[PDB]
Design a protein around this ligand. Sequence first.
Ligand SMILES: Nc1ncnc2c1ncn2[C@@H]1O[C@H](CSCC[C@H](N)C(=O)O)[C@@H](O)[C@H]1O
Ligand SMILES: Nc1ncnc2c1ncn2[C@@H]1O[C@H](CSCC[C@H](N)C(=O)O)[C@@H](O)[C@H]1O
Lengths: 337, 337
Amino acid sequence: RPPDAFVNRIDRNIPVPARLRHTPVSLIEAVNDFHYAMMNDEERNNFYYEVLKKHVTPETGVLEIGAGSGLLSLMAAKLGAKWVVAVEGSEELAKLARENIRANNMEHQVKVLHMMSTELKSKHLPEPPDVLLSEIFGTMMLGESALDYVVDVRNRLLKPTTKIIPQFGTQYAVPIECDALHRISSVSGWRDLDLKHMMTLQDTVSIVFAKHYGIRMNSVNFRRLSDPIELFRVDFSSSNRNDIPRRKHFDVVAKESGTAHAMLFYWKVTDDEFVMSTDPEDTVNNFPRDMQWGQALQLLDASNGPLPTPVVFTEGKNYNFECNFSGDRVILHMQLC
Amino acid sequence: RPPDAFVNRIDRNIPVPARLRHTPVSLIEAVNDFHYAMMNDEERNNFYYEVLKKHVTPETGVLEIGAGSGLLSLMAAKLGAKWVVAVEGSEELAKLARENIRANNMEHQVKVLHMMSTELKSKHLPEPPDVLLSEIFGTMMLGESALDYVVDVRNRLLKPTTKIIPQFGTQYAVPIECDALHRISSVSGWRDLDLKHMMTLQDTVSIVFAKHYGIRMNSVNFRRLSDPIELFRVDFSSSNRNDIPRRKHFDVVAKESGTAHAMLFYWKVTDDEFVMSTDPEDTVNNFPRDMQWGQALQLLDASNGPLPTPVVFTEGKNYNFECNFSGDRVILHMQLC
Ligand SMILES: Nc1ncnc2c1ncn2[C@@H]1O[C@H](CSCC[C@H](N)C(=O)O)[C@@H](O)[C@H]1O
Ligand SMILES: Nc1ncnc2c1ncn2[C@@H]1O[C@H](CSCC[C@H](N)C(=O)O)[C@@H](O)[C@H]1O
């Protein structure tokens, strides 16, 4: 009986079926919160299948960072890989991956190791892999430290001819007007009652996932006020942290007049002709993707006064933004200068 | 300098304006996550204004449970209340309420006490109030223990003629088919790869807010498969916990054929002719309400087998559900029998 069995925190008058009772709550939460949505992103699954298909042969050894359900590792095995090893940091997700492997009679082909990729050593593998596979992207592309984890494996366990899937990733930002977002992130007053003091607290610093607001970008009216800003691009086979500056400046030309309530962040990952994008334009008919990755938002303050100042764009004018990054390049912030 | 100053957990390369720097993170989170949306629910504000208007005179003393921003207490003062006392459990929200009161020059009329209502005593008030006011409703109506807190004050601090605002609340449930929800809460497979084992973990126990899924009910296709089920009704001036059974059974007649993926929960609060509803039908044009309260969902399992069994409705047939409550009546669960 696990100390964190699901049944423990449920009220004793509420029924819990046997299949859930003694399962750790953390696993039920991970699968219900994330994994069903991931597995229903058919375009994501197809992207990985098509890219793997270009590379996997009976002679190809495949290493995956982050087994999860085991789906992508199962794909590599389906495609006839020589061997597949997947690392998974979560003990319970590792067990679950093994169950899915068992269900598809592939225990002889796919091995799941419970460990973080940082702890993986050459002795844990039959030989250096021909393919390195991962899907550890966040709502922000590098949100789950994809670059750092791939770099660590790339430095230590691969060989010169190893194909890293996926190869490329680009993080974008675009200033947007969005009245729905504005109405849940600001206030002025109610009739003759002044509530402007509430604005002193407006969080124009944090990156917040659209999901956290309760919003799906594809389901509200918003306007992109400029062409997309490429914040940075990485090649997972060659890039390092220092390929991304700690501070960058961008000249943003307004294509539309309006209020830039927020910066909208989305990304695009590619490998040869195949593309995995979180641009709302590309996810109108991909509800599971909008639920699993969605997009991120940072509210914009034009200045540093006692109250936030709206960022107002006039068509045809230039707007300079300073982008600051954390050391690991995971956290960023856009400030009008 | 507070130990939990907002600036503390922000990366040192990311700018933070003075207005945010030394403010406790908990306050910034509460206001950004909840209070802007609340304050932009114009129908909620109008409901309270109109009900207060029926009762508040220069002779009326008003007690509010839960000051928050201070908006509703400010309304009572605007309407010319004799005196207004609002309790607020959060020290920082109490301070914020006081700031809003100051901004509207009403410090002589509205007093905010930092305490939970359970700690409020007769000596803290000028006299027993003529009006008790609260907006402590959750996504589930009793989710923030509204009944318990009102009952405690009602037992101790009021007088026979005290008007309790709002008077009535009714919690509803309705079985729904919703393909979008289904696609982020289930899986069967991917091509020839069997993923049915993942279904052993489907959480058909928890009440989960639509917001948590990332979903807004008014923005996805869903079908109500029966008339609404009234789970319980309360009169805040008279009801107690034992007016709600610990277990209830409901006969639900299918009006439509389809799969009942989930029970959808919403509520309606009334006082005389005025209504505050979280039924999606009533919130199509109230985005802030859908963001602040929204609706709740419980996934349905027809049985207690090793895998979940879909609940399938055929038009014209009867379906029996057992509703179990926690002791405080805050948590409930619907099970097909
Ligand atoms: N550096 C690392 N080492 C091992 N596991 C990791 C990791 N970073 C993330 N993970 C795990 O990787 C998974 C990412 S999501 C699962 C992806 C899965 N292969 C699929 O495509 O369907 C999570 O289960 C997480 O626990
Ligand atoms: N029993 C209780 N005693 C005191 N404060 C409470 C309470 N239950 C909830 N609260 C506080 O009540 C507030 C509810 S939301 C704020 C409502 C505000 N009066 C408005 O209508 O705009 C929160 O700030 C919460 O901290």
